């Protein structure tokens, strides 16, 4: 089988590009975000097509996070995306430690369908003091619900060009209406489906000029769907 590998140097002081995942903070922590992991093994995909992400209509399929990644306050910490052709599989590592691990795979015929759905609203601050009392210290950066409804199961999300904070609001809206009491974070995910072409087609502009996207988490079918991105069979664990 054919072979793909990349590294990541994730630094997150104040003048490198990734500074804003010091907005990702976590009971006094920064962490690397679920959809940090999930961005960087797209690109790797996507690298060894010859093709860019916007190009890469996307499947993942049972996603295992065996450990949190800490990040450094200085320097940097090195993330190896590995990618197998034959089994679809993929591995992150950090300093030779198993990181995640799951499939992940080019979607051939995008059904659009996917991101449709049959057809009392809490404010953006409102939102994140509710989070911040559950437990999650979310910075600027990562604060992309615009507003949501008091159940959690719908709601508006800024997008921003960046995938990682995007899908991470997707997350975010999902503990929104969950009867969890404290702080949880993700262990595995069933499956993620991305099709970029249907994200651009459902991306709005409000009045004031930001680019939106509508976001709804079922219950019943256990998702959650806004602009180009499925998510399907999100669990999660308490952490201190």
């Given amino acids: 089988s054919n072979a793909s590998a990349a590294i990541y140097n994730i630094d ?6 990734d500074h804003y995942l010091v907005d990702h ?6 962490l690397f975000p679920a959809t940090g992991y999930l961005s960087i093994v797209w690109k790797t995909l996507a690298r060894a097509l010859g093709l860019g992400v916007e ?3 996307v499947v993942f ?3 295992v996070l065996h450990q949190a990644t800490i990040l450094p306050k200085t320097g940097t910490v090195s993330l190896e995306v590995r990618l197998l052709e034959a089994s679809r599989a993929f591995e992150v590592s950090e300093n030779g ?3 995640v691990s799951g499939k992940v795979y080019q979607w ?3 059904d659009p369908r996917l991101f449709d759905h049959p057809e009392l609203f809490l404010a953006q601050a409102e939102v994140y003091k509710e989070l911040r009392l559950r437990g999650y210290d979310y910075g600027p950066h990562f604060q992309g619900i615009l507003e949501a409804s008091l159940e959690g199961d719908s709601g508006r999300l800024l997008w921003k060009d960046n ?3 995007f899908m991470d609001t997707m997350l975010q809206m999902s503990i929104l209406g969950s009867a969890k009491h404290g702080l949880y974070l993700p262990t595995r995910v069933t499956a993620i489906h991305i099709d970029p072409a ?3 087609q459902k991306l709005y502009t409000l009045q004031d000029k930001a680019q939106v996207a509508d976001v709804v988490v079922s219950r019943w079918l256990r998702v959650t769907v806004a602009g180009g991105v499925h998510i399907s069979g999100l669990h999660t664990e308490s952490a201190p």
């Fill in 12 to 17: 997150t002081s104040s003048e490198s590009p």
């Fill in 25 to 30: 903070t976590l009971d006094g922590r920064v």
């Fill in 55 to 57: 190009q890469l209509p």
């Fill in 61 to 63: 399929e049972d996603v």
């Fill in 97 to 99: 430690n198993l990181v």
């Fill in 108 to 110: 051939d015929d995008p």
């Fill in 163 to 165: 995938w990682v904070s």
């Fill in 198 to 200: 249907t994200h651009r």
